[PDB]
Amino acid sequence: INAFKEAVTKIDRVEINRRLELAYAYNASIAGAKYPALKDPYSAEQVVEYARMLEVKEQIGHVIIPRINQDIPIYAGSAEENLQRGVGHLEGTSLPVGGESTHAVLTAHRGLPTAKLFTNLDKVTVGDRFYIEHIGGKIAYQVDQIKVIAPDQLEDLYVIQGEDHVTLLTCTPYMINSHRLLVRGKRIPYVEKT
């Protein structure tokens, strides 16, 4: 929410860059494999510390989607704790700080009575934009692909070398959840202007 934007301003640029660098290294690591053992976010299988460097007052950034007027905190891992309050990052996929050979997967709950979250993620079209905001600032994506897969298929979630992507992942059809609707953005130039 607001505790992020503010809490961020209070941190020193050097500290920030130290922390971003640690994330880039993580990402470069993931990019390098071979394929990470990826695991259905929608199950208990046991706090998470992989993304400590990005963590600022519990979150690691914010996901903005103008088309559906959503601005949702992001939390590391996909524990139900976090899916109750916002989007959860899927451990094994790139940290959502961007860079070539990264593919971050962000996942969210549809239909919750508390928050809407990715409830209206079906209204998102190719062409649309969303933004990840993190300790580093705000980066921009343009939806380049929307795809419906079976729950045990994952090829679509891996890093694509030389490419910079973020996928918003939810369940589908609405209220049947036999499948997974993936909305994947592709990094585009964005000059944050006051």
Nearest alpha-carbon partner for 76 in 63, 95, 97: 95
CA separation, residue 99 to residues 63, 77, 110 (Å): 17, 21, 29
Give the single-character DSSP code of 2: H
Characterize the bridge pairing of strands 102-107 and 164-172.
parallel
User: In the block, which residue shows the tokens 């585009």?
Assistant: 188
Distance CA 169, CA 182 (A): 5
Class of domain 1-194: mainly beta
- How far is residue 138's CA from residue 162's CA, in Å, rounded to a whole number? 21
Reported as type and span, the H/E element at residue 82 is: helix 80-83
Residues tagged active-site: 109, 171
129, β-bridge pairs: 142
- Residue 9: left if φ>0, alpha if ψ -120 to 50, beta else—which one? alpha
Q: Which experimental method was this entry solved with? A: X-ray
3-state SS class at 51: coil
Type of residue found at 158? Y
From residue 162, give the alpha-carbon distance in Å to each of 69, 86, 112, 129, 133.
31, 29, 36, 21, 22
Q: What is the CA radius of gyration of the chain?
A: 16
Residue type present at position 124? V
Q: Which tokens is 176 given? A: 């049947």
